Design a protein around this ligand. Structure first.
Ligand SMILES: Nc1nc2c(ncn2[C@@H]2O[C@H](COP(=O)(O)OP(=O)(O)OP(=O)(O)O)[C@@H](O)[C@H]2O)c(=O)[nH]1
Ligand SMILES: Nc1ncnc2c1ncn2[C@@H]1O[C@H](COP(=O)(O)OP(=O)(O)CP(=O)(O)O)[C@@H](O)[C@H]1O
Ligand SMILES: Nc1nc2c(ncn2[C@@H]2O[C@H](COP(=O)(O)OP(=O)(O)O)[C@@H](O)[C@H]2O)c(=O)[nH]1
Ligand SMILES: [Ca+2]
Ligand SMILES: [Ca+2]
Ligand SMILES: [Ca+2]
Ligand SMILES: [Mg+2]
Ligand SMILES: [Mg+2]
Ligand SMILES: [Mg+2]
Lengths: 54, 334, 423, 437
């Protein structure tokens, strides 16, 4: 039961009590993934309009 | 109209409990994967406790205490008794045990004191992966057989029944409900050996070993099972004492000691789901009428004559107490 | 401001559509001249979903009235709320469709569909954020069935990213005009499988049974049938017309209700159905709401399983007691809800009740038992088609037998798809 | 002084943020018009509250916050709310049509069209900062915007502000208040593509807030206003060290240092006490020992789980009110000899304690009663993995039949992202079990 690192001030205080010692993708790649999804949407819409055209 | 599921088909105890629930006309069994249940007769291995108590408008109850394996495992029971101050290593009702994969040098430390001191130095090695057990007086044979196991002092002076000069063990069924009331079933069984005890099959009192490797199976009592009425009568005629005084007081003490020890770790008092569990305590009695705890079973079976009475009691005090419809136990108060 | 464009096509579509606008104009406080005369701002909070705002604080329904005969639409313009509809939004022909799907879809209706699309385009251009379209029609006739599904196909071609929602009246030999109704319905159902996101299956067989068996009407009329459709249409659109958070728009409703694109045909239900001053309790609302006798599709839900369920309670009641009763129906009949879609029953509450009721309940179910409706239609189709009976009415309009064989196969596939998720 | 920028995404993020900044103004004595009479440095300063509020020459204290929603009706509440005068319109960003509870619609379809506008408005707040700490991101798991657009924003923030820390306040989905069946999909999709971009995330399970509101506040059917006022209290306990003088958790880096030793395991469990109904005219004030003991009751946790069946990696106690270090240590010694508090072998068994003497602030007329002392415990337990198991199971049930998947593929998302995200959760769930057993 050791209390260490007691820091006090006007609005409160803080301390640590120990009980026992122990024993990213680039902007280019994000833009590629976003545009890849838009292209798959555009392709799905093209097939629908092709289907409605028939 | 309560709903329940069955996730352990091989449970002979809860197959009868699930059978009684349907007989009341107020319990409806669902598919094993339907989460809209009140009661789960769950599986022994990897019960998904983390998914219980998250169904809105459903009081959910399970037939196993999460964490009770610390009491129902060989190495876990040893570690729990040595390290818990509520039980202490000064425990007087548990045989001197050690865990070997560690406590190898610690086991040989007390082994040399018995060999030198001319005392009885016979031990026994067992584990949870058994039906594989070795009983020897040489520590070198016990350690080679293991190559997790536990080695404890073999009770060389057991209480032997007469006529027969034979060993036995006492199985007590204990039911712990959602409020952590400890209910000891008034009916126990003595799983007796049918062979005379030779300190030079007759040592292992298991019901499967006495029916396969023993030749006197069913000679003295039916199925090598003697119930409490016959055993108490024998204690009065042979030893001039009762089962309650000589043995059953220590049994109730050990059951309370073990269960009250793990209560803070497994209680579902303020938890989002409730638990109960049927336990099987195995006791050994020595020639001094001293009771010793052997092991605790978390998924126990039952005696055929007592399946009816006990399974009905499981519904009464553990299931219908949480889900009422429209005593065979001794309440170990604490 | 997510606006909806309403379209009613054919005799049935326009009669049912007219009662719908008559009902919800009452609930929102709009009088037959378009002047608001309500007493609660909840009536106006989502008023723009269905109504345009004109000069003088006038509220004009965003509704387009379509037919190939003037007859029924003249009765709408002379009906109780006829003056409220935008006069330019009456688009009608003169030939009629003669209960012929081919005339509405291929010959007579093709001549008129472009002037309908011109009115649709005008309503959409004045939409701050058009969310989609709702169409009322029958499947057994010619205009609502044949031209309706032609409209839906063309509306989708011009607005591919908007939700298409329909109230579709299924034909029944109990309430039948002509023997060719199974032909028209089978041809339309395949169109709906492809070109709508949500379809409310309103079965005239169920409406007849409810009027006869429950409401004790020995000789029901189309008016008596449409009274049930009004209450149902008002109920399923409550979440769209009033402040809420469950299925507040058409796309979120489709996301919660449609797990597979083709299985989007719902069983509507309403409670109470009284033959009347007695107050209905919350347990009573929930029991009737899930009972087959309140279902508008004539399918036994116990013959199938619930994929998803939407329940809407209207009135001032205990929301706590509402949750308990909803959780009671599921936890006492959980064998009828699929276990592979967790929490597939969503409950909504609205404070404003329908006219003349202290409280009501509306049921929107995506059940696999709806296959009984399609099987029923498919049997009547095959009974005539195996002998090519009455087919000349259609071959004389340019259709080939192969199109009927294909529509028959498409619907048996739809039935098979419902059967595979029922197991 | 180092500034923090708060980002509120979706309906849940905006309404919770709305409740937080209301509480912040009550705590710091800032009136709805932006004025702060106790601030004697007019038009500037590097005080502790300046980490969340900028200052105009006219004396207005403006929140360093951005509100983003793909639908205007929720943010329009802020535009006309009680604290409308705090924010300027550049901080409020709305769209036309929302994501319709579809992760793919909020991440790909609609998110791509608005990601540059939001980042540009965030850049305006960053330019007013002399030493930006990082960001606090409030969002829901189940909503299409809160899941889909957040994960895109977290990706882009790691690109544009790589050295800065990012903390999440995430709303875990609960069927008692949820509005969509596909929320398990959105939760796992967004946890997958946000995991590598978040340093510390605080999950709030609506189920827990709901029952705390019903049990402790006697609210029969709690509303979002009930839930958010309780959440903002927990959020205030967590962010109080950034807004007030102190030495524990003084910057966003310290949260990761004190609570997250393993980067993937960055989901501390929050436990709050006491929650007292204001309808009780006179309730007995709980003691330090009593509120600290309540920090180990599951019924007071922000996520229902059993920390007894798990191991601790860290533990912080944040007290607000009449609390002195003597009483804290007296309570901890008693709790040690009564509770099951197992730490991992490679971590010290201890507690970092923070005390702020100002007692908690409650919204006047709200449901929470004013108390003399309160505590929020932040503990990194492996037991919180139970919430992942529940989520992952509901995922597996629907995905086995591919239910609702077509809605996501229709937005340009590949079906493989589903199993790629699920495999990540299986990896995460396996990391917890290794650390925990
Ligand atoms: N605690 C709390 N949870 C909320 C609140 N609002 C919504 N939720 C939860 O958030 C989830 C839905 O996310 P939303 O924030 O409503 O959706 P969104 O982020 O706006 O995205 P959209 O789909 O485009 O509307 C559900 O589980 C709700 O229970 C709130 O104010 N407080
Ligand atoms: N220390 C000891 N001294 C004497 N006998 C012992 C002993 N430990 C075990 N035994 C004997 O060995 C037998 C088996 O013990 P154990 O309980 O480990 O087997 P088991 O667990 O496979 C049967 P179950 O779990 O089904 O009750 C017991 O019947 C007991 O008589
Ligand atoms: N419920 C209801 N069904 C109708 C009504 N009018 C016609 N029907 C049904 O609709 C089918 C005939 O379609 P109809 O609308 O008259 O054909 P259309 O005008 O050419 O589209 C038949 O199955 C009728 O049972 C009505 O007012 N209400
Ligand atoms: Ca012509
Ligand atoms: Ca200042
Ligand atoms: Ca980073
Ligand atoms: Mg055993
Ligand atoms: Mg007609
Ligand atoms: Mg939203």
């Amino acid at each position: 039961m050791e209390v260490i690192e007691l820091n006090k001030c006007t609005s409160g205080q803080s301390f640590e009590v120990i009980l026992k010692p122990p024993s990213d993708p680039s902007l280019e790649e994000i833009q590629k993934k976003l545009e890849a999804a838009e292209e798959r949407r555009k392709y799905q819409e093209a097939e629908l309009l092709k289907h409605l055209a028939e | 109209m309560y709903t329940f599921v069955v996730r352990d088909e091989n449970s002979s105890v809860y197959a009868e409990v699930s059978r009684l629930l349907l007989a009341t006309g107020q319990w409806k069994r669902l598919r094993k994967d339907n989460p809209r249940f009140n009661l789960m007769l769950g599986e022994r291995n990897r019960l998904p406790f983390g998914r219980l108590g998250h169904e809105p408008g459903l009081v959910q109850l399970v037939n196993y205490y999460r964490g009770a394996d610390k009491l129902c495992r060989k190495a876990s029971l040893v570690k729990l008794i040595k390290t818990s101050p509520e039980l202490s290593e000064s425990c007087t009702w548990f045989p001197e045990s050690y865990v070997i994969y560690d406590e190898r040098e610690v086991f040989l430390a007390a082994y040399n004191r018995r060999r030198e001191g001319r005392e009885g130095n016979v031990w026994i090695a067992k584990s949870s992966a058994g039906a594989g057990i070795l009983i020897s007086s040489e520590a070198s044979e016990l350690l080679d057989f293991i190559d997790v196991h536990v080695i404890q002092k073999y009770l060389e002076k057991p209480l032997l029944l007469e006529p027969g000069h034979r060993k036995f063990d006492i199985r007590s069924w204990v039911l712990v409900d959602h409020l952590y009331n400890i209910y000891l079933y008034r009916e126990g069984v003595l799983r007796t050996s049918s062979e005379p005890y030779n300190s030079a099959t007759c040592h292992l009192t298991n019901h499967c070993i006495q029916k396969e490797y023993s030749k006197n199976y069913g000679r003295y009592e039916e199925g090598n099972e003697m119930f409490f009425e016959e055993f108490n009568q024998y204690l009065m005629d042979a030893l001039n004492t009762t089962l309650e005084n000589s043995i059953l007081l220590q049994i109730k003490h050990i059951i309370r000691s073990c269960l009250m020890c793990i209560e803070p770790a497994i209680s579902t008092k303020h938890l989002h789901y409730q638990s109960f569990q049927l336990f099987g305590f195995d006791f050994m009695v020595d020639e001094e009428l001293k009771v010793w705890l052997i092991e605790v079973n978390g998924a126990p079976a039952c005696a055929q004559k007592l399946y009816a009475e006990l399974c009905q009691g499981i519904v009464d005090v553990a299931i219908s107490s949480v889900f009422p419809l429209a005593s065979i136990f001794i309440k170990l108060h604490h | 401001m997510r606006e909806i464009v309403h379209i009613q096509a054919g005799q049935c579509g326009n009669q049912i559509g007219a009662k719908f606008w008559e009902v919800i104009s009452d609930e929102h406080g709009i009088d037959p001249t378009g002047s608001y005369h309500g007493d609660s701002d909840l009536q106006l909070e989502r008023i723009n979903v269905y109504y345009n705002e004109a000069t003088g604080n006038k509220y004009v329904p965003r509704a387009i009235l379509v037919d190939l005969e003037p007859g029924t639409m003249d009765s709408v313009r002379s009906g109780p709320f006829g003056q409220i509809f935008r006069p330019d939004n009456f688009v009608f022909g003169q030939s009629g469709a003669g209960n012929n799907w081919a005339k509405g879809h291929y010959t007579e209706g093709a001549e008129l569909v472009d002037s309908v699309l011109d009115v649709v385009r005008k309503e959409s251009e004045s939409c701050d954020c058009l969310q989609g379209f709702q169409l009322t029609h029958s499947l057994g006739g010619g205009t609502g069935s044949g031209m309706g599904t032609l409209l839906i196909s063309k509306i989708r071609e011009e607005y591919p990213d908007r939700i298409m929602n329909t109230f579709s009246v299924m034909p029944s030999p109990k309430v039948s005009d002509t023997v060719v109704e199974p032909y028209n319905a089978t041809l339309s159902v395949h169109q709906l499988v492809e070109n709508t996101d949500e379809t409310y299956c309103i079965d005239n067989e169920a409406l007849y049974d409810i009027c006869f068996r429950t409401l004790k009407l020995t000789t029901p009329t189309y008016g008596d049938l449409n009274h049930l459709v009004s209450a149902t249409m008002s109920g399923v659109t409550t979440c769209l017309r009033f402040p809420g958070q469950l299925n507040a728009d058409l796309r979120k409703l489709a996301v919660n209700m449609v797990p597979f694109p083709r299985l989007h045909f719902f069983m509507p239900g309403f409670a109470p159905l009284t033959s009347q001053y007695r107050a209905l309790t919350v347990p009573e609302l929930t029991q009737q709401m899930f009972d087959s006798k309140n279902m508008m599709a004539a399918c036994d839900p116990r013959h199938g399983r619930y994929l998803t369920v939407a329940a809407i309670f209207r009135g001032r009641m205990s929301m706590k007691e509402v949750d308990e009763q909803m959780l009671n129906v599921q936890n006492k009949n959980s064998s009828y809800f699929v276990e592979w879609i967790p929490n597939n029953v969503k409950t909504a509450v609205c404070d404003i009740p329908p006219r003349g009721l202290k409280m009501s309940a509306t049921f929107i179910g995506n059940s696999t038992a709806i296959q009984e409706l399609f099987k029923r239609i498919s049997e009547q189709f095959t009974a005539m088609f195996r002998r090519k009976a009455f087919l000349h009415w259609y071959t004389g309009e340019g259709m080939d037998e192969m199109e009927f064989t294909e529509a028959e196969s498409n619907m048996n596939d739809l039935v098979s798809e419902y059967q595979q998720y029922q197991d | 002084m180092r500034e923090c920028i708060s980002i509120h995404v979706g309906q849940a993020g905006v309404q919770i943020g709305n409740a937080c900044w209301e509480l912040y103004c009550l705590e710091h004595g800032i009136q709805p018009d932006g004025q702060m009479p106790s601030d004697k440095t007019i038009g500037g300063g590097d005080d502790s509250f300046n980490t969340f509020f900028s200052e105009t020459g006219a004396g207005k204290h403006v929140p360093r916050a951005v509100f983003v929603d793909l639908e205007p009706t929720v943010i329009d509440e802020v535009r006309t709310g009680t604290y409308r005068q705090l924010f300027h319109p550049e901080q409020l960003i709305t769209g036309k049509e929302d994501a319709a509870n579809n992760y793919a619609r909020g991440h790909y379809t609609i998110g791509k069209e608005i990601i540059d506008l939001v980042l540009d408005r965030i850049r305006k707040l960053a330019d007013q900062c002399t030493g930006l700490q990082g960001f606090l991101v409030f969002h829901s798991f189940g909503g299409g915007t809160g899941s889909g657009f957040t994960s895109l924003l977290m990706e882009r923030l790691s690109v544009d502000y790589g050295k800065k820390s990012k903390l999440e306040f995430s709303i875990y989905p609960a069927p008692q208040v949820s509005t969509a069946v596909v929320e398990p999909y959105n939760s796992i999709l967004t946890t997958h593509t946000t995991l590598e971009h978040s340093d510390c995330a605080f999950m709030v399970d609506n189920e827990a807030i709901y029952d705390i509101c019903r049990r402790n506040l006697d609210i029969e059917r709690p509303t979002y206003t009930n839930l958010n006022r309780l959440i903002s209290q927990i959020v205030s306990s967590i962010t109080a060290s950034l807004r007030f003088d102190g030495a524990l958790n003084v910057d966003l880096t310290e949260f990761q240092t004190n609570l997250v030793p393993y980067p993937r395991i960055h989901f501390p469990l929050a436990t709050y006490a006491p929650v007292i109904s204001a309808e009780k005219a006179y309730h007995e004030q709980l003691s330090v020992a009593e509120i600290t003991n309540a920090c180990f009751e599951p019924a007071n946790q922000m996520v229902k789980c059993d920390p007894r069946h798990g191991k601790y990696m860290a533990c912080c106690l944040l007290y607000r009110g009449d609390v002195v270090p003597k009483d804290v240590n007296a309570a901890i010694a008693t709790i040690k000899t009564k509770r099951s508090i197992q730490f991992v072998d490679w971590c010290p068994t201890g507690f970092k304690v923070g005390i702020n003497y100002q007692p908690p602030t409650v919204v006047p007329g709200g449901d929470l009663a004013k108390v003399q002392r309160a505590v929020c415990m932040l503990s990194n337990t492996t037991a919180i993995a139970e919430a992942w198991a529940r989520l992952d199971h509901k995922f597996d049930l629907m995905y086995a039949k591919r239910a609702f998947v077509h809605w996501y593929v229709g937005e340009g998302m590949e079906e493989g992202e589903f199993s790629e995200a699920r495999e990540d959760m299986a990896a995460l769930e396996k990391d917890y079990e290794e650390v925990g057993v």
